[PDB]
Protein: Glucagon-like peptide 2
Organism: Homo sapiens
Amino acid sequence: HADGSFSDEMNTILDNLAARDFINWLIQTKITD
């Protein structure tokens, strides 16, 4: 927190919407099998 409280969401979009959306959504298909 601080004033806009934007950092928090700005971090979750990376942790949540990147680790599981860089090689686990349009690519694991070409790896698991």
Observations:
- Residues 21 and 29 are 13 Å apart (CA to CA).
- Helices lie at 6-19, 29-32.
